[PDB]
C-alpha cells in the first residue's frame, strides 16, 4: 500500500523486535553490577515497554553503561515509531480531506 502505511507498520514490527532484544540485552548488561534490578527477563520486558512509551515509572532502570545504551535504543525506537504513526495518520487525513473539499 501507500509508503507511510508501509513505514508505520514496519515501525511496529521493528519496535516489537527492539522490545524483545532490548529486554534480553538489558539483563545481559546489568547482571554483574551490584545493586542492579533489571536482571530477570519478565520485568525487563515490562521495563522496555514503559521506556519505549516514555512513561518511565522509575520502578526499574539500568545502572550500567551498556544497559543504559540499550535503554537509549529502546527509547528512540519507541519514539520514532510513534512519530511515524502520527505522520502516517496525518497523511491519510490530509490526502483524505483533499477529497471532501
Amino acid at each position: 500500500s501507500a509508503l507511510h502505511w508501509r513505514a508505520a507498520g514496519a515501525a511496529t514490527v521493528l519496535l516489537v523486535i527492539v522490545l524483545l532484544a532490548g529486554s534480553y540485552l538489558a539483563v545481559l548488561a546489568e547482571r554483574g553490577a551490584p545493586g542492579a534490578q533489571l536482571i530477570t527477563y519478565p520485568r525487563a520486558l515490562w521495563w522496555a515497554c514503559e521506556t519505549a512509551t516514555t512513561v518511565x515509572y522509575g520502578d526499574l532502570y539500568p545502572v550500567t553503561l551498556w544497559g543504559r545504551l540499550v535503554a537509549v535504543v529502546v527509547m528512540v525506537a519507541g519514539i520514532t515509531s510513534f512519530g511515524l504513526v502520527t505522520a502516517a495518520l496525518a497523511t491519510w487525513f490530509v490526502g483524505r480531506e483533499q477529497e471532501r473539499r
Binding site: 546489568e30 547482571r31 554483574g32 553490577a33 551490584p34 545493586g35 542492579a36 534490578q37 536482571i39 530477570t40
Partner: protein
C-alpha cells in the same frame, strides 16, 4: 548486597503441628524470595517461588507468605519427611544471595 537472615537456626516442632520459618531481608525486595529444601546428603529442591507461588510436585502442606523485608515459609502439620535444612534466596538485586538456613527438627 542483600543480606538474608534466617533465625532461628534450628526449629523443633511436635509431629503434626504447624511450623513457620522466617527470612528477613536487609532491604525491601518485593516478593522476589524463593525457598529451597535440602535433606541430608541431598541437593537443594525448589519449594516455593516468589514468596508464595506453589511448584508442581510439592505437597500442598507447604505455603509461603510475605513481601518487602519479612518472609515466612509455613508447613501445615509437619511430618518426618520434612526433616531437612531450609534456605531462602532472593533475586530482587544482583547478586542473588542465600539465607544462612534453618534446620527442621521434630
Amino acid at each position: 548486597d542483600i543480606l538474608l537472615t534466617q533465625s532461628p537456626a534450628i526449629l523443633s516442632v511436635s509431629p503434626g503441628e504447624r511450623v513457620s520459618f522466617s527470612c528477613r531481608a536487609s532491604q525491601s525486595i518485593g516478593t522476589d524470595i524463593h525457598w529451597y529444601q535440602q535433606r541430608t546428603n541431598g541437593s537443594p529442591r525448589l519449594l516455593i517461588k516468589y514468596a508464595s507461588e506453589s511448584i508442581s510436585g510439592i505437597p500442598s502442606r507447604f505455603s509461603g507468605s510475605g513481601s518487602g523485608t519479612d518472609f515466612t515459609l509455613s508447613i501445615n502439620s509437619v511430618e518426618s519427611e520434612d526433616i531437612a535444612n531450609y534456605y531462602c534466596q532472593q533475586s530482587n538485586r544482583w547478586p542473588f544471595t542465600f539465607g544462612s538456613g534453618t534446620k527442621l527438627e521434630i
